Structure formats: C-alpha cells, structure tokens
Amino acid sequence: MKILYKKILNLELWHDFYLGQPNTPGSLPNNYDISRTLALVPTQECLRVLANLRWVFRPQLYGASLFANVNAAPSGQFPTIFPIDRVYRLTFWLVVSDRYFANFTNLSLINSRNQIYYFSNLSGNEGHALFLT
Amino acid sequence: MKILYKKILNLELWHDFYLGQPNTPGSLPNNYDISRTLALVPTQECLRVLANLRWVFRPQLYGASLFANVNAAPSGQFPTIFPIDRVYRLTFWLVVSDRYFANFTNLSLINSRNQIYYFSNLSGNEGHALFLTQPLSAYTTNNEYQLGQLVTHADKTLESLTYQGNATNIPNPSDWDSLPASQYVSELDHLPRQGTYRTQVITNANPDNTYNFTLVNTNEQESWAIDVIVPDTHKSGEPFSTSLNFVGQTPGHYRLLENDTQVAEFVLVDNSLPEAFALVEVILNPELVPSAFSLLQASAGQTFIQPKTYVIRFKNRATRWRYRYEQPHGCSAANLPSYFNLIDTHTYATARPIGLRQRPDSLLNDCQDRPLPAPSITLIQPETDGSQRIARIFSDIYL
Amino acid sequence: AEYPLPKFHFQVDWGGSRLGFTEVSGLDVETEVIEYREGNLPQYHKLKMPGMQKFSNITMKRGTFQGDNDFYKWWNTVALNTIERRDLTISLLNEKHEPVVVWKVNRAWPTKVQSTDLKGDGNEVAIESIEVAHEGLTIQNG
Amino acid sequence: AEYPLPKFHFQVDWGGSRLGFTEVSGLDVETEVIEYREGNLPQYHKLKMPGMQKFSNITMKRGTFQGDNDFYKWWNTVALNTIERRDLTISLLNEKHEPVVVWKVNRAWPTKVQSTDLKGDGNEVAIESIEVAHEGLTIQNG
Amino acid sequence: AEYPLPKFHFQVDWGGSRLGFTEVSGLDVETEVIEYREGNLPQYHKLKMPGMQKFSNITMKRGTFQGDNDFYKWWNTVALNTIERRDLTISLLNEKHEPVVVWKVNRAWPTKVQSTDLKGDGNEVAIESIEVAHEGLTIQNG
Amino acid sequence: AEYPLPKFHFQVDWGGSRLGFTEVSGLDVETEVIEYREGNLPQYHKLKMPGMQKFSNITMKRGTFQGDNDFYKWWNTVALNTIERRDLTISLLNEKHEPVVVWKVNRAWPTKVQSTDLKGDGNEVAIESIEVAHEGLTIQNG
Amino acid sequence: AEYPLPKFHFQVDWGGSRLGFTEVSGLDVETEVIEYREGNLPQYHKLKMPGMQKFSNITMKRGTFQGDNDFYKWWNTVALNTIERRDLTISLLNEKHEPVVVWKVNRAWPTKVQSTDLKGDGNEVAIESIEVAHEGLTIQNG
Amino acid sequence: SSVIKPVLKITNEQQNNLNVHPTGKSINAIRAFTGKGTLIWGARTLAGNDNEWRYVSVRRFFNMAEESIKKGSEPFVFEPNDANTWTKVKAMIENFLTLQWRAGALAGAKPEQAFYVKIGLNETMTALDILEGRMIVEIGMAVVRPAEFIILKFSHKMQ
C-alpha cells in the first residue's frame, strides 16, 4: 500500500509588531514565530470533509499547511486519487493566545462585541501576494 | 565412561573496517573481535541433527567452532564413534548486532527487502583460503559495471569508482583502485527469499494438459510435489496463476521445477527468526563437496576427521569526504592540499574516495597545517543520476 | 513564557478582611481504579477502568496580628448543620503581578482552626492555621 | 557499549504538547509465588511455583510554565467509566542521542494530578506531578 | 588463613551472559520453635523444640550496559505455572582469586525485576535489580 | 510431575455468546449410607452399605455488559412444565490454551437469576448470578 | 466492548417527588423444582422439571429531609383490603444520562416503613427505609 | 428473519459444484433445514482456491487492521526519518496487534508467536530510502481458520 503526500496549501500570518516595515516584502525571516500569539483550529465539518477528501492538516511555526494524497505521474504533474470536481468548503477558527493583543494591533477602539472578522479566497487583491483581505 | 572431543571445524568472519588491507593475508591478529557485530545461530533442525551426531557447537570471539566425539587410535587418526556415511545438512542464521552496519560494509544501495544472502561449501574458490563465497568475475571488455563492483585482473582485485557503460581494453586507472588478491562478498550471493505461500504463473496455459511441480534441495533430493489442472474453459495461450503452499519444509536453498524444467530458485524461510541477515549451509556428502573442502575421510570401514577452516569476508565502503563550514574559511586553490577540491568558500571535498576505518592510520592536513577530524558513520549521502543511477557518495564533516 | 515559574508570589481571595498568607497546600484531584478479569482471558493480570472522584482538604497558614480575629470569625458561624460557605480563589503571580495560574474552589467552609504554641525560649513569630473542606476544584492555566 | 550508562538523559512520548520532564519512576514487573507441600515429603519446607502478574503505577514530575495546562487536560477527559487512553514510550539516550533502552507502556490513563505548594519563603521552582495506570509494560535493550 | 576476609571480591554463576554484580544480599536459614508445658512441671516457663525450615529470597544489583537485556530475558520465560529454573552458585574470592566460601542455591527462578529511575539532576550510574526465589541453600567453607 | 495446577484459567460452554466468568462453584457427587444390625452380632455398632445418589445445583457469576441479556433470555423460555435444556461443558485450561480437566453436565436448565444491587457509594463493578439444576455430572482427567 | 458497568448511577420512578436513593436491593426471580423417579429406572437419582414461580420483596433506602413525608403518605392510603398500587421503574444510567438496564415492577404497594434511630453520640445522617410487594418483574437490557 | 421460504431447493450434490470449482469462482447457498428456519450456508470468496484469501472473514479482518494501522501512522507525515520515529511507530503497531490477539482473533500462545513487525535500516530500508523520504514497514500475522467438514464413523461394539 503506497501512499504519497504533497503539500497543497500555505497559510501565513504576518504582524508588524515583530517584522516592522521592510522596504520591499519578500519572505519572512528564518526565526519568525507566532506559535504563542495566534492559532488556527479546524471545525468539525472541516474535519470530516478533510477525512473524506484524504487531506491532512498540520500546524506550523508561521501558520498551517495542508497535504493532499496524490499519484506520481511521469509528466511531473500530480493528480489526486480521484477527481475532485464538485464544490467544497473548508472553515477554520482563528484564536488569540496573547493577552494585551488588542493594544499593539491597530484595531478599532469602538465598542463592538457583536461583530467578528472574516477572511476568504474570494477577495481578489493579488498584488505582491495572495491577500485574504 | 571415557568421552573424547576434538575440534572439527573453523568458521571465521572478516571485516576490513577493523583489519584493513594486509599486503599478504595470513591469520587474524591476536586482538580480533566481532562478538558485538555478528552472530551465528543454529536452527532447530541443526540442533537435533548435532544431537544425533554427538557434535558440540561453540561460539567464539571470531566466529564459531564444532567439536566431534572421537576414539583415540594409535595411528594418530581419529575415527568417529560410528561411521558417518550418509548425507547430512547443517544450517545457521547470521544475525547483525551493530546498527549503522549497512553504512560501512560496501553493500548494494538498491532497494531489496525480498532478498537474502547465502553461503555454502559448494562454491569452490580455494585460493589462499577456503572461501564460502562465489568466485569473483573477471575484468572484461565492453561491459557495464556499477559504482562499487569488485573484479579480478592481473593478479589483483579492482574496485569501481564510477559508472561505465562500455569498458576499455586496459583498465582506466582513474576508475579503479589496486588492492591485494582476495575474495569478498558481492551481488553474486543475493538470492530472493520466500515464505510459505507462492503465486506461480504458467505461460501458454493449455487446458488439454496438466503440470507436476517439484522442489529439489542441494542434495538433489525431491522434497515436495503437487499437481495443477487447468480448467477446460480457459482460452489456450493466456497466463494462469495458482497458489502454492510449502508449510512443511525446512529453511534452505531450493530449486522449483515444473515438468523437467527449472522455473525458479530461492531460499525458503519459515520466519522463526525473521530479522536474520544471512544463511550458512554446510553439507556432508562424499559426492558433491570436493576434497579440498570435505571434513571426513573413509577408510577401512571407518571415517576419520580432518579439521578445516572456512572463511567469509566483508569489504569496507569508500566515500568522498566533504568538509563544510559555518563561517567562511580563508583557504584557496593555491594553498590547499593537492588532494583537495575547493567547492566554494565554505566547502571543499576530496577528489577520490577514501575507505572507512575505525582507526584510520593517518588524517589529512589543512592548508594551515592542521589535522582534521575523520567522518562519522551515522550518515551517508548518495546522489542519484538523471537515469536514477548512483553517481557519487559523500560523507559530510561539519566544522 | 519561556522560563519556569517560581513559587513565592501568590494571593488568596477568601472573603476575609486581610491578606498575606505564608503557606498554602493541598491542591489535588483523584479518581479510583476498578479492576476486572474473566477466567478465559489469555493474560493473567487484570483490566482497569475509572471510578469515582476524590478531593482533598486545603491548609493555609498565616502570621498573627493585633486586632485580626477572622479565622475564628468564619469558623464560629456554625449552627447544627448549617454554616456560611464561600467561593475560594487562589492565584499565582509573576514578576509583573499578572495572574497566571488560577485555582477555583467550590463551596468551602472551615473545618479546623489551630492557634500558636507558647515557648518561653522561642525566638519566632506566632503562626496560625486553618483547614478547609470544599465540594470542587478547577485549574486554569493560560 | 563498554561503559556503564548514566541516568540523566532521557525522553518521554505521552501524546502531550511539550517535553522536558524532571523525574520518572515506577518501572517494575512481578509474579506471585504459590506454595505447596504434602505430608510425606522428606524435606520440611515447601515447593514454589509461579502465579499471576502485577504491574505498578508510574509517576512523572515536571516544572510549571505559563500557558501549559496539559496534565489537567488529559485528566479532565473522564466520563463515567470512559477515558482517553494513550500509548506511552520512554527512552534513555546516550551521548550521541541514540535510543538505547526503551520502555513501552500499554493503555495508560492518568489517575492522579498534584500541583505545587506555595511558600512565602520558598526559593524553589514550582513542580507538578502526574500518576498513571496502565495495562502492560515491555523492555527493549539492544 | 589467619587473617579475616574482606567482602568486596566475589562472583556469581547464574547462567547469564555477563558478570560483574554490585550487590548480593539475602543469604539466611531458619527453623521454627515449638513450645510445650504441662501443668505439673516445677518450672513456670516452657520447653522448646525444633520445627519446620524457612529460606529467604535473594536480591542482586548490577549496572546497566548497552546491548544487555538478560534479567528481562530470564523473567520473560514464564508460562502459566512453568518457568526455566537454574542452579545458582555464589563464591567469595581471596587475593589470589581462589574460591573460599561457596553458597549453592537450588531451583531458582526470578520473581521480580526493577529498572532504574530517571532524574534530570542525577549524577549517578543507572542500576537494576533482580529478586529470586529458590528451594534450597547450602554453605561450604574449607 | 511435582507441581499441581492453579484455579484461575477456565472456560464454560453453555449456549450463550460470552465464554468468560468470574466464579463457578457447586461441583459435587454423593451417595447415601444405609445401616443395619441384627441382635446377635458380637460388635455393638452397625454395618454400612451404599444407597441412592445425589447431585448439587451449580452457581455461576459474571459481570454486566451493555447489550447482553442472556441469563434472562434462557430463564424466560419456561412454559408450564417445559423448558429448553442444554448440555453444559466446563474445562480447566493450560498454558497451550487446551483442556486438562473436564466436567460434563447433563440436562441443565436455569432455576434462578439474580441481578446486582445498587449503592450510591459503591466503587465496584456490577455482577449477576445464575443457578442451574441438572440430571447428571461426569469428571474426565487425563 | 471489554469493560463492564459500575453500580452507583441509577434512578427510580415510584410516584413520589424525589428521584434519588442510596440503596435499592431485592431484584430476583425463581422457579421451583419438581422431582420424580420410578422403580425400574437404571439410574438411582431423580428427574427434575419446572414448577411455579416466586418473586421477592424490594427494599429502598434514602435520607431524610425537612418537609418530605412521602413514604408515610403512600403507606397510609390503606383501607381494609384496598390500597393504591403503582407501576415501578428502575433504571441504571450511563454517561449521557440515559438508561441501559431497566427493571419494570408490576402492581407494587408498600408493606413496611422504618424510620431512623436516635443516638446522642451518632455522627451520621438519618436514613429511612421502605419495603414493597409486587406482582411481577421484567428485565430489559439492550 | 421475515422470510417464508427460498424459491429453489438446493441439494448436496449441487452444493458440491457450487462450493468448489476448478475456476475458483464459488457460490454460497441459502438453504432450509427442518426445524431451524432458512440459513446461510457457505462463507467463501470468489477466489476459493487461494490459500490466503479463501474466506470472507479473513479478508474483511485484514482490511480493518490495515485501515487502523494507516490511521495510526498518519500523524508522522513530514517528521524526521530517523530511529526515534521508527520506535514510536513500531510501538503503536504492536500495541494494536496485542489488543487484537488477546480477544481471540489471532493464533499463538504469546504475542511473540502471533505477529511480528519489521521497520529499520537493517530490516526493510536503505540509505537511498532515507534520502528519498520513504518509510517501509513489514507486518506478519497468523489468523484462525474455520472447520467446514465433520465426519462421523459408526460401528457395532464388540460383545
């Protein structure tokens, strides 16, 4: 039983409290880390859908990653074990670990306890990166 | 009750990781020891057969030994308590104790998990010892040798340093090294191992016929047989698969035949000791083992013992040493040891492979004249080719 | 966040007037083991599964001051089988005095009060102790 | 291979987030003795034969860090008689960090968790402990 | 022959691969007392006579080496009520390595095996112990 | 040999799914005595001879599992004077998971079923019992 | 599965307000045996067949509260030979607060009520008991 | 349950050809027996001449076991390919197989005779496999097989 896995997604989270303003953004430094400030958590539906699709979730020092189960073709292209040709939807909670977070993060100081943030891949904004904002 | 015992067999195991290359092989040194790297283990059949023959097994610091129970004659000849005049077969597992063994032993790096090694006293090869390996092939012209092959030529033994799709009339000195004349282990001893159940395929399956399969061991005795009947709705000419069961046989070397034709040859295994490394077989048969290898003489209605010493030998691996740095080193192509090659400002490597030893005699000097540490045996880095062939093997030293 | 914590900077909310306790011990939780084996099991030792829970009493020690009679005050509110129960909070603080580890106790009433002993040759401060029973405990870290 | 080993370089796989334990004790195995004698035996002491097996609980101690609440997390997964069981691995390492001796535990769930005590005069780190029950143990050396 | 002997140079034959034990204790023999008195005896204390014999378990301690798993090997040969029994020999040697005092044990099988404990601050060697039961003991001196 | 067997590795064939019990007792056989004496016999005590046979009821105890209602199932197959009778086999097993001593019980039907008792403070498993009547018993050893 | 159930989490429907008891015992069923033998049977012991059924009384114990006089209330509804009969349900609960084993008791009325005893030196709670007769019982598992 | 009768009656002589055939394709029957109802009679696969995959229960059990092993050894993806991970993986597999043995699924007097697990450099792997990133594990298991035929022999007792 041969099982081949390949990375299929990169999710990164940046904060100028650590990075500052580089004169031209590239990649993060080699010592970047937010593993104690922010965390990504799959929901239950996300878990069972990843199970059905045979994909694997993994936390990282900069965010998370997804691994797909593929077949090794000669062309160099990697097909999935079966054609994923329907519509699918994956959701994740973003949780904060560091207290005083709302003090160094440039957020709105207006009283909002009935609102929540939201990020997606339906936002265009493809400049020097793929921005989920 | 007087009981007399005499040594009747010497089994030795050599490794160049400890010995090196002597200019002419004799005996081992007085401080030789592999008691923590390799071990010989008798099987169950071997145990009960040694019991019936009244022989005694004993481990040693270099291998093992066998002791026979004999009668003291005046002539100086030593006869066994009874005439051993039938055919007998003794088997032993060879097990490895030292991890990282596959790194300093010059073995084939190609993925083989369905094969096992095999050694016997039916291999001839009586040169300066009694070698239980197969005789090494000769250096020819226009053949294909992989990196690591050992051959024989002009009273010497040649090692391969790179891949050659077509050979030369005379050895190219930049592709071969020059060692003394001796035999070693090679890919000529890598037989496929098998368990209890087999899937055998008949080509051109003909419903109008039958087939009788047989199993033949080293003593040329039939040990097993069944029949298979192809049904009469099978379109003539297609392959046909069948299942075979060898549940009641003792592990060893066998040839599988179908109707007076060799179809396969393999070492049969019962997984009594699944992690065994190799198998050793020793035979008592006055017809199959030559006189240079036999251990019993027959005369005057009796048998007399002849002590012998059999040898197996392993050669060490050879890698290219690569020194890597954290901060830049200030040495240049104009001030470094001639045997080096500057790769970049943080790296330089040897130009020819060096052999892995435990107490490497002399170490290399730096351009500033300083001894450098030798590599470790925990990691090796083979690099594959465009055609997915092995091209080079390094050892990295981080300074 | 990267260093291990020390054990000498803490505080206790116990519905009492003053603060400044010396020793606080007794913070444990446990579950009982139940064992089982049937005759035909190939192993010759037993199987284990969880049972009921158990909690310990908590002990606190502090020094004696003029005008402060709070341990006795709380203990003395006892009628036949009725008493005044309180919620207890214990917190461990770090260098910047931020609560890091919190123990929450449920329904705690004082079962024992011990006063100091008097020695004509004792060069030490007078210390008093209280022992408390409760019906629950919960740990919160981070 | 020729030297005796020390006892201060080890690691524990316990399905927990962090590592770095201080003390690990409790690794034992035992069998009970059964005795027998009949009246006409010329010796006046008994014969002995093996019986049932017995295994001990395992104790582990570690230091306390901000944000780490894993012992409590594992202990608190207990329903009436159900709990989350894990496979435990303990390994002793040598100078070159190679696993030499391995202890494999089977079906282990936490039976007890003890937190630190608080002293106004204590110049020491805070340490916590866990006690674990299991249904098997196996030793592998070489 | 005229000097008293020391207690630090000895050896043990136990059918095991290696040698070099640190501690060996438990070498004892005993007999029970039976007491009796009838009403008209002029002395008002009892008479005593010998009864049954009793033997103790033997404990041995040694240091841990890479590749040596012999205590476990012997302990693990146990079926329901069958096990591999061995003859044990212990000898005390003098300056010229000549056996002087010999203890012969009869039918000994291992009842207990204890491994070392792990301490992050322990500057000592790792030691293991075995406990053995037997059905006889005999002393030979000179 | 010289060692006898233990009492904790057995199995029961009774017609139900599970094959593991915690207790099996009641395996006996008996014959009555008849006495006789005539007036002129020189001894003044009686002569004795065999009479009729008697067998006992058998009791079995096991632990309670979700989904298993077999004792009740067998008991509840009772009409006016008809019931489902079964052949019962009890065997005492050895190391090779085989049988050494076999008890064969003829024409068995359940006469009594007892369920567990419920205690708010009971830290034990729930156990149930069955009591069975039969018309014969036979022992086979070796 | 492989683990059985505990005995301390249950509930009782009996027609009164409170639903928590400390003890419930008496859940049994039985059938008598009838024996028969004729003179010419080659075996010298009897044949056995089923007879009539028998059920037991049920006992329940609980603690005493101010304002609750329910045992007496039910007992005191008795006229000459008429009384108020109720259907009784007993269930053994699981982690999800559901029922696994159910006992259904048919036509129950209280035959006995016992109050606590008074001790000037008794450090215990006051407990009361009721004993109930019925005309049927049924077990449901899974 | 909820069955009256099968539509056809099968005899033993027909069952002989349904159950065993030179082509290996086998047909399991459903037959009525006096007083017992209608019962399933036969438990073979379509590969009835295969010494390993003759029976349904063996194949289904193997499927279950390998699925559980896959799920157990998934979390180690993108972990260091060294001895420590190999130790952990072997421990997980052996604990699962021990639990399966003690319930009566596997044959053997101890867990040493019921199964074996091989993972390592000197067992199933080489340096090339370390560089590639591949892990190879070999697992052997002995399962219990049923009894299909019961033969009774009768005689007149000597007297």
Author numbering:
A (entry chain AB): 1 to 133
B (entry chain FB): 1 to 399
C (entry chain BD), D (entry chain AD), E (entry chain FD), F (entry chain AE), G (entry chain BE): 2 to 143
H (entry chain AC): 324 to 482
Task: Please share text taken word for word from the publication where this structure appeared.
Their contractile apparatus is homologous to contractile phage tails, using a contractile outer sheath to propel an effector-loaded tube into target cells. Here, we characterized a CIS in the multicellular cyanobacterium Anabaena, with features distinct from extracellular CISs and T6SSs. In contrast to cytoplasmic free-floating eCISs and cytoplasmic membrane-anchored T6SSs, Anabaena CISs are anchored to the TM, which is mediated by modified tail fibres and a baseplate component.
The resulting maps of the baseplate and of the distal end cap reached resolutions of ~2.9 and ~2.8 Å, respectively. The distal end of the CIS was capped by a tail terminator complex. In contrast to previously studied CISs, the cap of the Anabaena CIS was composed of two proteins, Cis16A and Cis16B, forming a C6-symmetrical complex that terminated the inner tube and sheath, respectively. The structure of the sheath–tube was highly conserved to related CISs and was composed of 23 hexameric layers of the sheath protein Cis2 and 22 hexameric rings of the inner tube protein Cis1. Further details regarding this spike plug and the bipartite cap in a related system are discussed in an accompanying study.
